[PDB]
Design a binder for this molecule. Structure first.
Ligand SMILES: Nc1c(C(=O)O)ccc(Cl)c1O
Ligand SMILES: Nc1c(C(=O)O)ccc(Cl)c1O
Ligand SMILES: [Fe+2]
Ligand SMILES: [Fe+2]
Ligand SMILES: [Fe+2]
Ligand SMILES: [Fe+2]
Lengths: 173, 173
């Protein structure tokens, strides 16, 4: 009835899964089929998508440094996750995690979205800042529903084309 | 729109709130009015009540050692939270945290219970193991609704009297 197992040493768990906390994978969920989605995210990794999580996200940067590109008060802002920092992100704050360092490790905790509560993923234009593309997803498993989504955005000039100034978003990088 | 503030160094936050992570207080919530209830629990502290959380609880023992008295498969079991351990408790697993050491620090994460989802608190008989008393609570703030509850149990021989063998539960210790 300990559905998720006995306690276990977290530093050794992170050491042991080092090879998963690098490209191409980068992150690894700790427990399966739980309400709390508990993930360790490594590096390096950069991304252009912004996430619209309808729930809160908890961050604890155990190893290395990272940062969150945000949209707060309509203005682009950056929040640093220095090694040792903890942080709670309010629901719906657009965020784009940048993880420049190898060997970094960040604990991220979220919960399973209830049916009908959708995650959004959006890109914004470097030229005029308008919204470029947005996909909403009933997010049941990030590693499975998200890659195909990001890929169809990079593959389509149409999706990448800003409706305000015509600039075509660079895509992946 | 960063409702819960910017990131901040967690070890220094724990050092700075040392005096709250001792008796009589013992624990301290990190953010107010959030869906994720994020608590640091110190020591020393022992307790006889078992908690019936209708949701999951995440534990990360950053400093020192602790342990959880449990009821699993009807049998009394113990789960150690050695320094560095992480642990996810499934919903409704009865648990009684024992925190014998001063200077220990454990990160506990839960979420606000929705209306109608009740926490239970129960005591069991050292003589025959039957259930002795159970209070259900719409738990809106632990530090406010729980002390009066525990106190009314210690103050009442009636509540402390086992319905199976008549043994009167010791109460607080
Ligand atoms: N913020 C993240 C990250 C991240 O911090 O890059 C990785 C996976 C998931 Cl599910 C997240 O919510
Ligand atoms: N397990 C705990 C503890 C604990 O680990 O003693 C303290 C406060 C809260 Cl709200 C908890 O759920
Ligand atoms: Fe996210
Ligand atoms: Fe544009
Ligand atoms: Fe609890
Ligand atoms: Fe008894």
């Amino acid at each position: 009835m300990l559905t998720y197992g006995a306690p276990f040493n977290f530093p050794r768990w992170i050491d042991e899964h080092a090879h998963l906390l690098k490209p191409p994978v980068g992150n690894r969920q700790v427990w399966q089929d739980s309400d709390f989605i508990v993930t360790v995210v490594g590096g390096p990794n950069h991304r252009t998508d912004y996430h619209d999580d309808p729930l809160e996200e908890f961050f604890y940067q155990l190893r290395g440094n990272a940062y969150l590109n945000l949209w707060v008060d309509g203005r682009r802002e950056r929040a640093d996750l220095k090694e040792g920092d903890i942080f709670l992100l309010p629901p719906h704050v657009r965020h784009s995690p940048q993880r420049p360092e190898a060997g970094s490790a960040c604990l991220v905790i979220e919960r399973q979205r209830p049916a009908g509560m959708l995650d959004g993923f959006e890109w914004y234009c470097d030229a005029c800042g308008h919204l470029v593309h947005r996909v909403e997803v009933q997010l049941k498993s990030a590693v499975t529903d998200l890659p195909p989504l990001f890929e169809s955005f990079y593959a389509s000039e149409d999706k990448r084309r800003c409706p305000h100034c015509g600039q075509v978003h660079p895509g992946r990088a």
